Design a protein around this ligand. Structure first.
Ligand SMILES: Nc1nc2c(ncn2[C@@H]2O[C@H](COP(=O)(O)OP(=O)(O)OP(O)(O)=S)[C@@H](O)[C@H]2O)c(=O)[nH]1
Length: 305
């Protein structure tokens, strides 16, 4: 009922902006940064500057230690901001200083408060350099110890979706959109009750912080949309392990008012047919009025180990 989405650092805050612009509902947004300048470009209602004393508003200069200590300096404000949350999503681009360093601290505060804590983060593009990869790896494992589930999106695979024409700025806008889809694929099923009844217990069921969780997305229009989006999702480049490896699978099929009973059934059956015979699978369905002839299928795969 109290669902919070908390973006951390530049990348995460940009993802929270795409979410606000697509009027994702049912969630309270919070933006967190060590950089005061960037913070004021956030559209989130609550804007939290962390590590005022340590960084004086100037960012964490690409050092995860500073991001971590910034979030520790602001320990009590993060607690106040999150009090009463049943569920907390923590988004960030891993690789820099504030995301990598602060996101784990914020995730741990949320778990400690009893929130169901899901992380949704990206691993950086290979073109960003070995040092960004290293820093990111470090924060990804830190995050896994601090969340109930960590969804990890490998940015390189985004380049296998958008065309090879795409320059950096547009590539990163796509990353904001994958991050949004990872949060929203889950939050939409739980923010409001759908036509398929789907509760917290159902969602707790697919939660594992043992191994990075992975997501697949598929989008289609036209008369064969259900099967095409289901099939694309199970074949998403973002889904680096095959879906049959997963012990847990959440599936979100979203569509417009013409989303049909047979499509739901078809998409659910495709995804279940690709999955392990003993998978624990929870399916949800939501109507998005703004979609017209397009459907979206998201799968979150967990418990690969
Ligand atoms: N989704 C998204 N990801 C971004 C964007 N800009 C950079 N990234 C990714 O996130 C990673 C971290 O960058 P960023 O969020 O901007 O740093 P920061 O966490 O704020 O860290 P800092 O030291 O500058 S204070 C980058 O390595 C890159 O992969 C963006 O605008 N949107």
């Amino acid at each position: 009922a109290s669902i919070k989405v908390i973006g951390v650092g530049g990348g995460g805050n940009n993802a929270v902006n795409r979410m606000i612009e697509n009027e994702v509902q049912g969630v309270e947004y919070i933006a967190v940064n060590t950089d005061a300048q960037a913070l004021n470009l956030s559209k989130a209602e609550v804007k939290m500057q962390i590590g005022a004393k340590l960084t004086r508003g100037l960012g964490a200069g690409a050092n995860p230690e500073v991001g971590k200590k910034a979030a520790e300096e602001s320990k009590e404000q993060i607690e106040e901001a999150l009090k009463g949350a049943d569920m907390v999503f923590v988004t960030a681009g891993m690789g820099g200083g504030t995301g990598t360093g602060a996101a784990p601290v914020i995730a741990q505060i949320a778990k400690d408060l009893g929130a169901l804590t899901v992380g949704v983060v990206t691993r950086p593009f290979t073109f960003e350099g070995r040092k960004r990869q290293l820093q990111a790896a470090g924060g990804i494992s830190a995050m896994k110890e601090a969340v109930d589930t960590l969804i990890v999106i490998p940015n390189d695979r985004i380049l296998e979706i958008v065309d090879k024409n795409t320059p950096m700025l547009e590539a990163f806008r796509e990353a904001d959109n994958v991050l949004r889809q990872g949060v929203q694929g889950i939050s939409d099923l739980i923010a409001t009750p759908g036509l398929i009844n789907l509760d917290f217990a159902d969602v707790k069921t697919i939660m594992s912080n043992k191994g990075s969780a992975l997501m697949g997305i598929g989008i289609a229009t036209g008369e064969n949309r259900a099967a095409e989006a289901a099939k694309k999702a199970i074949s998403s480049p973002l889904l680096e392990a095959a879906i049959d490896g997963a012990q847990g699978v959440l599936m979100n099929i979203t569509g417009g008012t013409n989303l049909s009973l047979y499509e739901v059934q078809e998409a659910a059956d495709i995804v279940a047919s690709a999955s392990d015979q003993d998978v624990n699978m929870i399916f949800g369905s939501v109507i998005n009025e703004n979609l017209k002839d397009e459907i979206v299928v998201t799968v979150i795969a967990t418990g690969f180990l």
